[PDB]
């Protein structure tokens with residue numbers, strides 16, 4: 267509660283629970299009610315039934331994301347998308363960035379993704395970070411890490427370098443190494459291939 | 465036999481088989497021999513034994529490549545190397561190009577492989593074709609081919625597109641489609657991974 271929180275949020279499931287009964291109370295107290303409510307707990311049960319998960323679960327999730335970011339000085343989670351040119355992904359990110367759900371980082375050749383974004387006419391993404399794995403400054407430290415993790419599992423430095431050039435691997439490593447808070451993939455390839463580097 | 469072939473080539477392996485027994489014969493007929501050769505078949509065999517594969521096999525292969533070339537107007541086989549930045553591959557390519565064995569096509573980001581070539585100082589490769597798979601004119605044509613080849617083996621257009629950006633897949637496709645006459649890979653990754661796209 268404060269200067270940046272003066273009223274409930276619209277996606278707050280409690281407004282109904284709090285407000286509808288006080289309105290009920292005021293209607294009866296003013297005598298304009300024709301049906302008295304006696305059991306108020308039972309009444310709130312009746313109100314919650316009206317607010318089930320098919321209506322409110324996602325709404326509440328989003329709210330919670332917002333409470334989390336707000337309670338952390340407002341930073342949004344950094345989420346990497348290895349499929350930077352995926353039409354579905356970019357279009358979703360429009361919605362997503364506009365509503366402060368995360369700070370996306372896209373992977374791919376910058377010129378080619380700025381191009382797909384312009385072709386699809388999504389202007390909300392002109393600020394988004396775009397990273398090409400091989401030319402990322404932390405690339406070689408990443409390959410060292412993958413190497414050390416899998417040197418006795420068929421992956422030496424040459425091969426680690428090769429894999430780390432793949433966005434799926436780069437993303438997984440960013441998340442692992444804390445250069446990202448999470449990642450989302452598989453919009454454009456089969457699950458096994460997308461999940462394996464994770 | 466003709467105006468451009470009046471004698472054996474210096475490295476003709478038949479020369480000993482042909483000349484040495486006639487010299488022996490002449491030595492005997494002229495009376496300067498002190499040990500007569502009786503079984504000539506046995507002698508010619510003994511001479512065959514003196515120039516075995518450890519002495520001539522690769523020499524003969526290389527000559528055979530050259531005269532193959534000559535019979536097609538000096539055409540060299542186009543061989544693609546997906547590991548355009550392998551120091552072993554480049555160093556060997558120095559010899560190979562210098563000795564007219566093939567016409568190499570390197571795969572990778574042209575800037576980084578030219579950096580490598582300059583770093584290792586192989587000046588005979590300033591002329592070598594360097595191709596970045598995704599930005600080659602026949603790239604999408606290739607992707608289509610791969611798609612139609614394995615659409616019922618877990619590869620639809622999206623994934624075909626992703627794979628065909630891999631130098632190994634690109635090289636294999638070049639050889640398949642006749643844009644290159646052969647390919648050599650596996651210098652810097654394990655065999656399974658190198659051979660699988662082939």
Ligand SMILES: CC(=O)SCCNC(=O)CCNC(=O)[C@H](O)C(C)(C)COP(=O)(O)OP(=O)(O)OC[C@H]1O[C@@H](n2cnc3c(N)ncnc32)[C@H](O)[C@@H]1OP(=O)(O)O
Pocket residue numbers: 617655656657659660
């Ligand atoms: C120089 C050296 O040191 S080699 C050292 C050790 N040797 C090795 O590690 C290779 C051991 N062999 C292997 O790992 C596997 O057999 C591989 C790499 C050859 C390929 O097999 P997998 O990894 O299982 O992939 P997969 O088999 O699904 O793809 C191979 C393709 O070639 C075909 N293929 C592979 N092996 C064969 C085979 N013996 N006979 C006929 N077809 C084959 C497959 O049918 C498949 O093609 P398709 O799916 O379109 O029909």
